[PDB]
Amino acid sequence: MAGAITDQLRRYLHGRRRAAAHMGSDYDGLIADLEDFVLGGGKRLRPLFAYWGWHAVASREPDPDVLLLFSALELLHAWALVHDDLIDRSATRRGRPTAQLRYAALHRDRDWRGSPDQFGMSAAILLGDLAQVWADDIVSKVCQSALAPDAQRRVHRVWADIRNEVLGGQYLDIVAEASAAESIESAMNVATLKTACYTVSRPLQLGTAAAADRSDVAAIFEHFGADLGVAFQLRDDVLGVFGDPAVTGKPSGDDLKSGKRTVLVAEAVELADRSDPLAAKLLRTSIGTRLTDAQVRELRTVIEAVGARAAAESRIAALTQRALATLASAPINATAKAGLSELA
Amino acid sequence: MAGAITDQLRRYLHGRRRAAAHMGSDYDGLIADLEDFVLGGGKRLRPLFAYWGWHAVASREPDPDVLLLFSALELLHAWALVHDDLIDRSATRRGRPTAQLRYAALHRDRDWRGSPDQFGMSAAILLGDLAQVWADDIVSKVCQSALAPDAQRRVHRVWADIRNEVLGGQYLDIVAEASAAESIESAMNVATLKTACYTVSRPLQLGTAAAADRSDVAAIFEHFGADLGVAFQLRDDVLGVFGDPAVTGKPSGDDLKSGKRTVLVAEAVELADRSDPLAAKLLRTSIGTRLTDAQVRELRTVIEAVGARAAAESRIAALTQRALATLASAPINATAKAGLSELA
Ligand code: DMA
Ligand code: DMA
Ligand SMILES: [Ca+2]
Ligand SMILES: [Ca+2]
Ligand SMILES: [Ca+2]
Ligand SMILES: [Ca+2]
C-alpha cells in the first residue's frame, strides 16, 4: 500500500536528517523542506506500479526494505519536479509555492544580502540534487542488504534506465519547444520517455527485477506501459486543453497558455492541414506565443473543430483496450492483472 | 595513474553514449558535450587521493574496474562544477565558456524560439544532473561486479557521505554569503565540507574502503585530510587575494571581487578589530559589494597590513607539517606515505 511505502520513505528521510545534524540548522531546514515536499502530497503512482511488477512475478509480499526501494521512485520524483520547476520557471506547484520562491522568501524574511531570486534558484538546484543523491542511496542500500546479487544487477539496470530516460525526455522536450517541433513523432518521443517509461514501464520493471529473473514479463510490461503511458499522456493533453480547472487544478487551456508541444496539439495541426489550411496556419503561428484568454478559447475550439479531441479520445480507448488485452494474456499472477487493470 | 583513470572513464562514457543513441541526435550532442567537459581538462586530484587510499592498505594494484570506480569522482566533480557555475552565475570556467552559455549559443545558432539564456540554464541543470546519475551508475556497477559485498558496503557509505557533504558545503556557502557570516568558524565549516572532506578525506577513504576493512586508516585519513584540506583552502584564499593572474588563471583579488567568505578574509576582520577598528569597518562594509579595481587593491593591502597574509602562511606551514607528521606515523605502506607526501 502507498501508505506503507510512504512511511518507509518517511523513516529513511528522518534517519538521514538526524545523521546530517552536524552540518548546522540552515542545512537542517533544507532537509526538513525536502521532507515537507515529498511527504506533503502525491499519489504515489510510481511505487504502486513497482509494487505490482513485484506481485506479477513473485508470491511473497515484498519485505519492508523492498517497499523502501519502491519509495525511492517517489524521492527521485521530487528531484525531477524541483528541477522541472526551475526549467519551466513555475511559481507554484499544486497550489504550493515552488522551491525557488520558498527560499527567495526565506532570503527576504532574514533580510539577507544579494538577489533573493538568485538564492532561491541556487537553493532549488541543491534541493533537487539532494533528493536525487538520497533517492539513489536508498537503491544502493536496499540492494546490498535485502536483495540477492542477481536481483541487485537487475534493479540497477532499471535504475540506470529510468534516470537516463527522464533526463533525455526533459532535454528532448525543451529542444522540441525551442525548435517548434510540429510533428506527432516529436511529441510522441517525449511522451514515451517522460510518461510511458518514467511513470509506467520502468517502475513496473523495477518491481519485477527485484522479484525474480523474468525477462519475458519485463518485455511485456514495456509494451503494456507503451500503451498505458501514452493513453495517460493523451488524457493529460485533453485535460490540459479542455479540462475544467475545478478538476485539473490548472487554468483552462493551460497547455496552450504554457505552449506545450503535445500529441493532441500536433495532431490538430495535421488534421487542420487536411480540413482547413488556414486553421493549421492559426495553430502554427500561435502555439508557444503570448496568448490572451480569447486567443486560447479560439484555439481550443479550433482543436475540437478539426476533430483532434475526438481523435484523441478514440486513440485513448484503443490504447487502453490493447494494454488490458496485453495484461489479460500475460504470464503473471491473476492478482497483478486485477491491480494493474484497476490503475489503467 | 591519472591517465589510466581517465581512459577508464572515457570508455565508460563512450559506452553509455552509444547505448543512449536511440534518444536522438540532440541528446547525443549533450552527452558529447559532457565528454568534452570531463575529459577536456582537469588535474584528476580526487581519483589520485582514492588511488593512494587503496595503496595505503592493499598490496595488489587495483583492478581496471576499480580505477573506473576512482574515475567516478571525476564525473561527480563535473556535476558539482556545472551546477556551481549556475549558482555563481559564472560565464567562463578555466578559459572555456560555462554550460549555460554554450547551450544559449546553440539556441541562437539554431535561431530557436524563446529566451536563449533560459534554455542554457535549463540545459545546464540537465547536464549536471546527467553527470551525477552516470557517476553514481559507475559506483553501483563496479560494486556489483568487482568488489566483495563487504567492500561494497564500505564504498557506498563513503559515496553517500561525499555527496551529502558537498551539497551541505554548497548550501552553507551561499547562506554564509547571503547572511554575511564574518566569523572564522563559518568559513572554516564551509572549507571542511567543500575542500577537506570533498577533495581529500572522502576520496582517500573511498580507496581504503574498496581495499580492506581498516577503520583505523579511514579515521586517520580524515584527520590527515582535515589538515591538508584546510591548508589547500588557505593556499587558495591567498592566491584568490594576492595571486598573480598569470599563475592562478583568475583576475587579481578575485575572491574580493566575487565576495567570497573565506578564512583569510574572516581572519583579516578579526586581526583588524585588534589593530585598527577602522580597517575592520572598511573590510566589513566592503566585502561582497560592488568593488572597483582601486577598492580591491586597497582591501588587498589592508589584508596584508593587519598581518592576515602572514598569519595564513604560518597556518599553512603548521597544518602541512602536522599532516605529514600524521602521515609518517600511519599504519600504512611506505609507498602511500611517499605518494601522499608528494601531493601535500
Ligand atoms: C520530468 C517531469 C515529471 C516533468 C513535469 O512535466 P511538465 O513540466 O509537463 O508538468 P508539471 O510541471 O505540471 O509536472
Ligand atoms: C562544489 C565546488 C567544487 C564548488 C566550486 O568552488 P567555487 O565556486 O568557490 O570556485 P570555482 O567555481 O572557481 O571552482
Ligand atoms: Ca516541463
Ligand atoms: Ca513544469
Ligand atoms: Ca561557488
Ligand atoms: Ca563558482
XYZ file of C-alpha atoms and ligand atoms in Angstrom:
720
model
C 0.000 0.000 0.000
C 1.100 3.578 -0.717
C 0.835 4.379 2.993
C 3.339 1.675 3.911
C 5.612 2.825 1.076
C 5.442 6.461 2.205
C 6.108 5.555 5.844
C 9.244 3.681 4.762
C 10.495 6.798 2.973
C 9.462 8.930 5.960
C 11.616 6.900 8.354
C 14.550 6.891 5.925
C 14.427 10.669 5.462
C 14.249 11.094 9.239
C 17.331 8.912 9.677
C 19.347 10.753 7.032
C 18.286 14.078 8.557
C 19.439 13.115 12.060
C 22.769 11.871 10.681
C 23.318 15.234 8.939
C 22.563 17.353 12.023
C 26.261 18.191 12.454
C 26.064 20.422 9.348
C 24.033 23.123 11.108
C 20.477 24.377 11.414
C 20.425 26.025 7.973
C 21.056 22.788 6.074
C 18.691 21.049 8.504
C 15.962 23.441 7.369
C 16.583 22.467 3.750
C 16.290 18.775 4.641
C 13.074 19.484 6.552
C 11.824 21.306 3.454
C 12.605 18.177 1.429
C 10.565 16.094 3.883
C 7.665 18.554 3.651
C 7.689 18.428 -0.158
C 7.950 14.675 -0.767
C 5.663 13.562 2.069
C 3.244 16.502 1.986
C 1.277 15.319 -1.037
C 1.356 12.972 -4.008
C -0.462 9.986 -5.489
C 2.456 7.523 -5.071
C 1.639 6.182 -8.546
C 5.161 5.064 -9.486
C 5.855 2.999 -6.317
C 2.474 1.324 -6.856
C 3.432 0.238 -10.379
C 6.640 -1.149 -8.875
C 4.575 -2.997 -6.261
C 2.527 -4.736 -8.963
C 5.592 -5.629 -11.025
C 6.787 -7.439 -7.908
C 3.420 -9.166 -7.386
C 3.131 -10.208 -11.043
C 6.180 -12.476 -10.716
C 6.609 -13.200 -7.002
C 4.414 -14.881 -4.392
C 5.579 -13.498 -1.046
C 4.668 -9.875 -0.461
C 7.779 -7.666 -0.522
C 9.934 -7.135 2.541
C 9.755 -3.731 4.276
C 13.164 -2.805 2.848
C 11.813 -3.584 -0.629
C 8.979 -1.124 -0.017
C 11.715 1.390 0.801
C 13.245 0.569 -2.587
C 9.869 1.285 -4.193
C 9.681 4.600 -2.315
C 12.956 5.673 -3.949
C 10.888 6.421 -7.059
C 8.956 8.992 -5.015
C 12.118 10.685 -3.748
C 13.533 10.550 -7.278
C 10.313 12.182 -8.492
C 10.906 15.117 -6.138
C 14.289 15.665 -7.801
C 12.589 15.734 -11.205
C 9.802 18.080 -10.076
C 12.114 20.516 -8.265
C 14.419 20.870 -11.269
C 11.463 20.941 -13.665
C 10.018 23.946 -11.815
C 13.304 25.765 -12.440
C 13.253 24.705 -16.101
C 9.631 25.804 -16.532
C 10.065 28.850 -14.250
C 6.902 27.876 -12.403
C 5.890 29.836 -9.314
C 3.503 27.277 -7.783
C 3.027 23.506 -7.857
C -0.339 22.047 -6.793
C -1.240 25.278 -5.025
C 2.011 25.424 -3.048
C 4.916 27.722 -3.976
C 7.816 26.181 -5.848
C 11.228 25.734 -4.250
C 12.861 28.808 -5.798
C 10.119 31.009 -4.316
C 10.231 29.423 -0.850
C 13.966 30.070 -0.499
C 13.712 33.542 -2.032
C 11.075 34.309 0.609
C 13.391 32.943 3.304
C 16.091 35.235 1.901
C 13.806 38.263 2.252
C 12.492 37.169 5.661
C 16.062 37.123 7.003
C 16.825 40.473 5.294
C 19.778 38.768 3.620
C 22.061 40.388 1.045
C 22.077 39.903 -2.715
C 19.395 38.798 -5.126
C 16.692 36.757 -3.341
C 15.631 35.159 -6.628
C 19.216 34.053 -7.299
C 19.442 32.486 -3.839
C 16.099 30.774 -4.408
C 17.260 29.353 -7.734
C 20.579 28.200 -6.263
C 18.884 26.561 -3.274
C 16.311 24.904 -5.548
C 19.116 23.355 -7.615
C 20.680 22.000 -4.422
C 17.303 20.818 -3.101
C 16.662 18.756 -6.222
C 20.250 17.494 -6.176
C 19.786 16.248 -2.608
C 16.575 14.391 -3.450
C 18.427 12.606 -6.261
C 21.504 11.520 -4.301
C 19.352 10.344 -1.379
C 16.899 8.505 -3.636
C 19.889 6.719 -5.131
C 21.358 5.925 -1.703
C 18.126 4.036 -0.988
C 18.653 1.792 -4.018
C 22.303 1.168 -3.141
C 21.434 0.448 0.498
C 18.456 -1.841 -0.156
C 20.351 -3.770 -2.844
C 23.291 -4.565 -0.552
C 21.132 -5.557 2.436
C 17.892 -7.071 1.105
C 18.477 -8.493 -2.398
C 20.413 -11.408 -3.824
C 23.281 -10.249 -6.078
C 21.379 -11.144 -9.258
C 18.373 -9.092 -8.163
C 20.798 -6.240 -7.434
C 22.077 -6.231 -11.019
C 18.541 -6.358 -12.421
C 17.481 -3.483 -10.156
C 20.471 -1.304 -11.070
C 19.870 -1.598 -14.820
C 16.294 -0.370 -14.386
C 17.540 2.391 -12.076
C 20.095 3.475 -14.680
C 17.441 3.434 -17.414
C 14.694 5.362 -15.613
C 17.035 8.235 -14.714
C 18.700 8.315 -18.140
C 15.327 8.385 -19.910
C 13.670 11.052 -17.750
C 16.684 13.298 -18.389
C 16.578 12.572 -22.116
C 12.839 13.195 -22.138
C 13.345 16.514 -20.359
C 16.036 17.666 -22.797
C 14.059 16.468 -25.822
C 11.069 18.448 -24.544
C 12.881 21.778 -24.176
C 14.524 21.257 -27.574
C 11.125 20.484 -29.113
C 9.627 23.709 -27.754
C 12.679 25.799 -28.664
C 12.811 24.348 -32.191
C 8.993 24.421 -32.596
C 8.730 20.721 -33.457
C 5.274 20.320 -35.003
C 5.340 16.601 -35.770
C 3.352 13.975 -33.896
C 6.585 11.957 -33.860
C 8.473 14.548 -31.797
C 5.682 14.854 -29.224
C 5.281 11.066 -29.085
C 9.000 10.508 -28.439
C 8.879 12.908 -25.484
C 5.739 11.216 -24.146
C 7.353 7.774 -24.417
C 10.359 8.839 -22.335
C 8.687 11.219 -19.875
C 5.402 9.335 -19.362
C 5.476 5.787 -20.760
C 8.911 4.741 -19.494
C 9.305 7.044 -16.492
C 5.832 6.561 -14.966
C 4.660 3.072 -16.033
C 7.230 0.826 -17.733
C 10.378 1.365 -15.663
C 8.547 1.346 -12.282
C 6.857 -1.923 -13.291
C 10.217 -3.404 -14.295
C 11.774 -2.190 -11.029
C 9.488 -4.452 -9.010
C 9.827 -7.349 -11.446
C 13.624 -7.046 -11.430
C 13.684 -7.194 -7.627
C 11.380 -10.235 -7.556
C 12.891 -12.743 -9.999
C 14.550 -13.180 -13.404
C 11.576 -12.859 -15.781
C 12.801 -11.182 -18.965
C 9.524 -12.288 -20.559
C 7.489 -10.264 -18.055
C 9.806 -7.244 -18.211
C 9.492 -7.138 -22.005
C 5.703 -7.382 -21.675
C 5.496 -4.580 -19.104
C 7.383 -2.381 -21.575
C 4.677 -2.929 -24.208
C 1.974 -2.572 -21.545
C 3.492 0.729 -20.440
C 3.955 1.859 -24.036
C 0.165 1.788 -24.482
C -0.988 2.800 -20.994
C 1.659 5.516 -20.728
C 0.660 7.173 -23.999
C -3.004 6.813 -23.024
C -2.168 8.600 -19.766
C -0.414 11.328 -21.765
C -3.281 11.877 -24.212
C -5.674 12.100 -21.262
C -3.481 14.846 -19.795
C -3.306 16.518 -23.218
C -7.110 16.671 -23.369
C -7.368 17.920 -19.780
C -4.614 20.455 -20.462
C -6.751 21.935 -23.260
C -10.399 21.166 -22.437
C -10.252 20.241 -18.752
C -12.296 22.048 -16.139
C -9.955 23.952 -13.770
C -12.017 22.539 -10.882
C -10.873 19.020 -11.855
C -7.386 19.527 -13.312
C -6.234 22.041 -10.711
C -4.777 24.064 -13.598
C -6.123 27.018 -15.605
C -8.324 26.479 -18.641
C -6.256 25.621 -21.702
C -3.074 25.505 -19.629
C -1.138 23.529 -22.253
C -1.970 26.232 -24.800
C -1.044 29.036 -22.390
C 2.246 27.358 -21.445
C 2.982 26.401 -25.058
C 3.402 22.648 -24.637
C 4.243 20.598 -27.737
C 1.721 17.843 -27.075
C 0.493 14.976 -29.234
C -3.017 16.468 -29.224
C -1.702 19.826 -30.440
C 0.458 18.071 -33.040
C -2.485 16.016 -34.307
C -4.646 19.148 -34.508
C -2.114 20.679 -36.906
C -2.116 17.546 -39.074
C -5.917 17.300 -39.130
C -6.184 21.020 -39.909
C -3.830 20.675 -42.891
C -6.427 18.278 -44.312
C -9.615 20.205 -43.431
C -8.774 23.930 -43.196
C -5.238 25.074 -44.113
C -5.958 28.473 -42.559
C -6.776 26.762 -39.259
C -3.432 24.953 -39.390
C -1.802 28.335 -40.013
C -3.668 29.713 -36.994
C -2.304 26.886 -34.842
C 1.270 27.040 -36.170
C 1.591 30.807 -35.682
C 0.010 30.783 -32.194
C 1.466 27.765 -30.361
C 4.116 28.856 -27.880
C 3.359 32.583 -28.182
C 1.876 35.055 -25.710
C -1.841 34.261 -25.956
C -4.721 36.226 -24.481
C -7.641 34.368 -22.920
C -9.658 34.940 -26.102
C -6.869 33.503 -28.264
C -6.768 30.437 -26.006
C -10.523 29.852 -26.294
C -10.355 30.235 -30.080
C -7.536 27.684 -30.292
C -9.467 25.320 -28.008
C -12.485 25.488 -30.323
C -10.318 25.022 -33.430
C -8.735 21.914 -31.890
C -12.170 20.377 -31.357
C -13.369 21.736 -34.720
C -10.827 19.719 -36.732
C -11.699 16.605 -34.745
C -8.455 16.489 -32.755
C -10.326 15.979 -29.473
C -12.425 13.114 -30.846
C -9.342 11.590 -32.481
C -7.573 11.725 -29.112
C -10.437 10.021 -27.260
C -10.596 7.111 -29.712
C -6.802 6.850 -29.546
C -7.128 6.674 -25.747
C -9.824 3.987 -25.849
C -7.797 1.905 -28.315
C -4.545 2.027 -26.332
C -6.357 1.355 -23.049
C -8.078 -1.698 -24.538
C -4.846 -3.087 -26.007
C -2.994 -2.531 -22.725
C -5.696 -4.518 -20.928
C -5.578 -7.168 -23.663
C -1.811 -7.356 -23.136
C -2.419 -7.631 -19.386
C -5.057 -10.381 -19.551
C -2.856 -12.774 -21.561
C 0.312 -12.111 -19.560
C 2.171 -14.972 -17.802
C 1.702 -13.301 -14.415
C -0.382 -13.807 -11.290
C -4.089 -13.019 -11.534
C -3.683 -10.641 -8.578
C -1.457 -8.255 -10.543
C -3.696 -8.419 -13.619
C -6.509 -7.143 -11.403
C -4.499 -4.438 -9.640
C -2.860 -3.144 -12.811
C -6.217 -3.179 -14.616
C -7.623 -1.045 -11.786
C -4.888 1.570 -12.256
C -5.416 1.550 -16.032
C 47.993 6.879 -12.885
C 45.549 9.663 -13.779
C 45.846 8.714 -17.451
C 44.662 5.167 -16.787
C 41.861 6.519 -14.585
C 40.740 8.992 -17.260
C 40.824 6.348 -20.000
C 38.550 4.140 -17.885
C 36.039 6.986 -17.606
C 36.465 7.730 -21.321
C 35.489 4.184 -22.303
C 32.560 4.168 -19.868
C 31.188 7.463 -21.196
C 31.555 6.148 -24.747
C 29.595 3.019 -23.841
C 26.784 4.939 -22.147
C 26.639 7.320 -25.117
C 26.284 4.507 -27.664
C 23.564 2.867 -25.555
C 21.609 6.156 -25.497
C 21.794 6.740 -29.265
C 18.115 5.807 -29.673
C 17.147 9.094 -27.963
C 18.155 11.236 -30.949
C 20.976 13.459 -32.135
C 20.063 16.375 -29.849
C 20.534 14.400 -26.630
C 23.606 12.793 -28.215
C 25.093 16.274 -28.566
C 24.544 16.907 -24.860
C 26.308 13.644 -23.991
C 29.178 14.567 -26.315
C 29.335 17.923 -24.528
C 29.613 16.034 -21.233
C 32.520 14.017 -22.648
C 34.227 17.205 -23.847
C 33.885 18.834 -20.417
C 35.017 15.996 -18.140
C 37.817 14.678 -20.361
C 38.912 18.001 -21.864
C 40.880 19.181 -18.840
C 41.416 18.620 -15.133
C 44.083 17.589 -12.635
C 42.379 14.306 -11.598
C 43.306 15.126 -7.992
C 40.403 13.314 -6.310
C 40.858 9.942 -8.103
C 44.552 10.130 -7.187
C 43.746 10.501 -3.483
C 41.470 7.477 -3.871
C 44.325 5.584 -5.538
C 46.610 6.201 -2.552
C 43.933 5.256 -0.024
C 43.825 1.922 -1.839
C 47.630 1.579 -1.838
C 47.939 2.522 1.845
C 46.032 -0.614 2.885
C 46.272 -3.055 -0.028
C 49.183 -4.762 -1.780
C 47.907 -5.621 -5.259
C 47.420 -2.628 -7.518
C 43.712 -2.011 -8.172
C 41.824 -3.803 -10.917
C 40.858 -1.791 -14.022
C 37.233 -1.694 -12.853
C 38.437 -0.218 -9.552
C 40.164 2.561 -11.491
C 36.769 3.166 -13.098
C 35.349 3.470 -9.579
C 38.025 6.065 -8.811
C 37.115 7.944 -12.004
C 33.537 8.304 -10.733
C 34.855 11.114 -8.523
C 35.848 12.984 -11.691
C 32.417 12.561 -13.280
C 30.827 13.525 -9.960
C 33.049 16.618 -9.942
C 31.612 17.677 -13.307
C 28.132 17.587 -11.760
C 29.341 19.845 -8.945
C 31.118 22.278 -11.283
C 28.238 22.528 -13.775
C 25.695 23.306 -11.057
C 28.153 25.584 -9.256
C 28.516 27.706 -12.403
C 24.741 28.200 -12.364
C 24.838 29.040 -8.647
C 27.708 31.500 -9.117
C 26.368 32.741 -12.484
C 29.826 32.321 -13.978
C 30.307 32.872 -17.703
C 33.626 31.025 -18.118
C 35.494 28.209 -16.377
C 39.247 27.833 -16.977
C 39.014 29.967 -20.102
C 36.160 27.943 -21.604
C 32.524 29.106 -21.552
C 30.265 27.617 -18.913
C 27.451 25.228 -19.793
C 24.629 27.783 -19.670
C 26.454 29.921 -22.251
C 27.290 27.021 -24.581
C 23.643 25.956 -24.826
C 22.406 29.544 -25.081
C 24.793 29.961 -28.020
C 23.444 26.749 -29.557
C 19.953 28.203 -29.102
C 20.933 31.348 -31.016
C 22.888 29.413 -33.658
C 19.752 27.403 -34.480
C 17.609 30.585 -34.424
C 15.382 28.854 -31.880
C 12.417 30.461 -30.122
C 12.224 31.782 -26.574
C 14.879 33.016 -24.195
C 18.314 31.591 -25.103
C 19.582 32.212 -21.568
C 16.642 30.262 -20.124
C 17.365 27.337 -22.448
C 21.037 27.495 -21.485
C 20.190 27.429 -17.783
C 17.719 24.565 -18.237
C 20.191 22.528 -20.295
C 22.969 23.215 -17.776
C 20.781 21.846 -14.970
C 20.167 18.702 -17.024
C 23.851 18.436 -17.978
C 24.924 18.447 -14.338
C 22.111 16.045 -13.457
C 23.356 13.590 -16.088
C 26.936 13.706 -14.805
C 25.642 12.849 -11.326
C 23.416 9.908 -12.267
C 26.125 8.448 -14.521
C 28.863 8.935 -11.923
C 26.650 7.043 -9.496
C 25.932 4.279 -12.023
C 29.694 3.665 -12.106
C 29.772 3.045 -8.351
C 26.738 0.751 -8.488
C 28.163 -1.158 -11.463
C 31.710 -1.564 -10.126
C 30.444 -2.610 -6.685
C 28.264 -5.416 -8.066
C 30.916 -6.755 -10.464
C 34.343 -6.129 -8.908
C 34.010 -5.896 -5.103
C 33.203 -8.326 -2.325
C 29.907 -7.458 -0.584
C 31.691 -6.001 2.454
C 33.778 -3.706 0.258
C 30.531 -2.670 -1.454
C 29.006 -1.513 1.835
C 32.170 0.372 2.792
C 32.267 2.053 -0.626
C 28.600 3.083 -0.525
C 28.903 4.788 2.868
C 31.765 6.939 1.579
C 29.789 7.629 -1.605
C 26.776 8.716 0.450
C 28.968 10.943 2.630
C 30.933 12.718 -0.107
C 27.772 13.725 -1.988
C 25.880 14.718 1.166
C 28.784 16.869 2.373
C 29.499 18.658 -0.914
C 25.811 19.607 -1.083
C 25.825 20.765 2.533
C 29.023 22.701 1.908
C 27.465 24.364 -1.132
C 24.317 25.378 0.758
C 26.299 26.549 3.790
C 28.417 28.697 1.467
C 25.517 30.515 -0.205
C 23.877 31.022 3.197
C 27.149 32.399 4.583
C 27.428 34.942 1.764
C 23.737 35.874 1.909
C 23.829 36.268 5.704
C 27.273 37.967 5.661
C 28.841 35.485 8.086
C 32.023 37.186 9.304
C 33.306 34.521 11.686
C 36.315 32.313 11.036
C 34.115 29.442 12.237
C 31.591 29.863 9.412
C 34.289 29.998 6.727
C 36.114 27.043 8.295
C 32.970 24.881 8.337
C 32.451 25.507 4.617
C 36.112 24.733 3.903
C 35.914 21.474 5.870
C 32.945 20.234 3.832
C 33.813 21.661 0.408
C 37.601 21.165 0.498
C 38.750 18.923 3.361
C 36.112 16.195 3.051
C 35.162 16.525 -0.618
C 38.687 16.764 -2.082
C 40.991 14.893 0.341
C 39.320 12.884 3.119
C 36.420 11.172 1.346
C 38.437 10.311 -1.813
C 41.139 8.788 0.409
C 38.518 6.775 2.298
C 36.938 5.667 -0.994
C 40.097 3.797 -1.969
C 40.655 2.452 1.542
C 37.049 1.240 1.756
C 37.417 -0.637 -1.535
C 40.701 -2.236 -0.431
C 40.032 -3.713 3.020
C 38.345 -3.142 6.391
C 40.728 -0.666 8.060
C 38.655 1.670 10.229
C 41.936 2.757 11.827
C 43.278 4.017 8.493
C 39.981 5.633 7.475
C 39.863 7.570 10.751
C 43.472 8.667 10.206
C 42.842 9.825 6.633
C 40.031 12.002 7.996
C 42.474 13.795 10.314
C 45.080 13.897 7.535
C 42.533 15.466 5.196
C 41.330 17.841 7.906
C 44.798 19.431 7.967
C 45.809 19.092 4.309
C 42.366 20.145 3.088
C 42.337 23.351 5.128
C 45.938 24.013 4.077
C 44.803 23.644 0.461
C 41.957 26.080 1.152
C 44.148 28.732 2.789
C 46.547 28.476 -0.153
C 43.626 29.179 -2.492
C 42.498 32.019 -0.212
C 45.923 33.661 -0.515
C 46.030 33.124 -4.284
C 42.466 34.424 -4.573
C 43.597 37.706 -2.980
C 47.323 38.102 -3.708
C 47.897 35.620 -6.532
C 49.339 36.658 -9.864
C 46.689 36.215 -12.604
C 49.403 34.547 -14.711
C 49.598 31.726 -12.134
C 46.058 31.470 -10.740
C 44.292 31.864 -14.077
C 41.902 34.253 -12.307
C 41.821 38.057 -12.011
C 43.757 39.849 -9.292
C 41.887 39.769 -5.994
C 39.206 37.516 -7.467
C 37.926 36.388 -4.057
C 37.414 40.041 -3.119
C 35.726 40.842 -6.441
C 33.433 37.808 -6.194
C 32.772 38.408 -2.490
C 33.856 35.038 -1.109
C 33.566 34.484 2.651
C 36.998 32.929 3.080
C 39.012 32.079 6.180
C 41.672 34.610 5.151
C 39.066 37.364 4.820
C 37.498 36.318 8.129
C 40.865 36.365 9.904
C 41.638 39.799 8.443
C 38.496 41.159 10.110
C 39.482 39.631 13.457
C 43.066 40.908 13.252
C 41.818 44.355 12.217
C 39.497 44.543 15.239
C 42.662 44.254 17.340
C 44.944 46.617 15.373
C 42.774 49.183 13.546
C 38.998 49.174 14.175
C 38.514 51.471 11.179
C 40.237 48.901 8.964
C 37.839 46.232 10.227
C 34.991 48.614 9.392
C 36.473 49.054 5.912
C 36.503 45.279 5.432
C 33.031 44.647 6.881
C 31.346 47.330 4.760
C 33.146 46.321 1.534
C 33.135 42.503 1.431
C 30.521 41.237 -1.006
C 29.768 44.660 -2.514
C 30.427 46.083 -5.972
C 34.125 46.974 -5.750
C 36.166 48.978 -8.230
C 39.709 47.885 -9.044
C 41.039 50.565 -6.685
C 38.814 49.335 -3.848
C 40.107 45.801 -4.436
C 43.755 46.893 -4.275
C 43.089 48.865 -1.086
C 41.449 45.837 0.538
C 44.346 43.630 -0.589
C 46.833 45.972 1.091
C 44.719 46.190 4.261
C 44.597 42.386 4.470
C 48.392 42.215 4.370
C 48.653 45.301 6.608
C 46.890 43.629 9.553
C 49.070 40.551 9.133
C 46.324 38.312 7.739
C 48.554 37.117 4.890
C 51.444 36.241 7.209
C 49.033 34.587 9.648
C 47.680 32.483 6.778
C 51.141 31.359 5.642
C 52.160 30.200 9.124
C 48.787 28.469 9.462
C 49.520 26.717 6.152
C 53.013 25.631 7.208
C 51.705 24.310 10.535
C 48.859 22.263 9.039
C 51.099 20.915 6.268
C 53.701 19.796 8.813
C 51.117 18.118 11.058
C 49.519 16.361 8.080
C 52.934 14.973 7.138
C 53.571 14.047 10.778
C 50.230 12.219 10.762
C 51.256 10.517 7.512
C 54.713 9.388 8.658
C 53.408 7.543 11.741
C 50.435 5.954 9.974
C 49.986 2.144 9.905
C 50.107 2.119 6.101
C 52.517 1.080 3.368
C 55.602 3.238 2.866
C 54.608 3.645 -0.795
C 51.462 5.612 0.069
C 53.286 7.738 2.648
C 55.600 8.823 -0.166
C 52.891 9.427 -2.766
C 50.585 11.291 -0.395
C 53.512 13.366 0.894
C 54.264 14.325 -2.719
C 50.707 15.600 -3.234
C 50.836 17.509 0.064
C 10.073 15.224 -15.526
C 8.701 15.751 -15.235
C 7.851 14.842 -14.403
C 8.271 16.914 -15.683
C 6.931 17.514 -15.395
O 6.155 17.638 -16.578
P 5.580 19.071 -17.010
O 6.672 20.071 -16.816
O 4.932 18.928 -18.347
O 4.412 19.343 -15.938
P 4.315 19.688 -14.348
O 5.398 20.698 -14.054
O 2.917 20.276 -14.170
O 4.528 18.398 -13.593
C 31.431 22.368 -5.133
C 32.520 23.181 -5.763
C 33.729 22.395 -6.166
C 32.429 24.485 -5.940
C 33.461 25.346 -6.598
O 34.013 26.281 -5.682
P 33.954 27.850 -6.011
O 32.587 28.149 -6.533
O 34.475 28.592 -4.825
O 35.027 28.024 -7.195
P 35.138 27.612 -8.768
O 33.786 27.877 -9.385
O 36.217 28.536 -9.329
O 35.506 26.150 -8.827
Ca 8.435 20.735 -18.009
Ca 6.754 22.161 -15.108
Ca 30.597 28.556 -5.612
Ca 31.880 29.018 -8.990
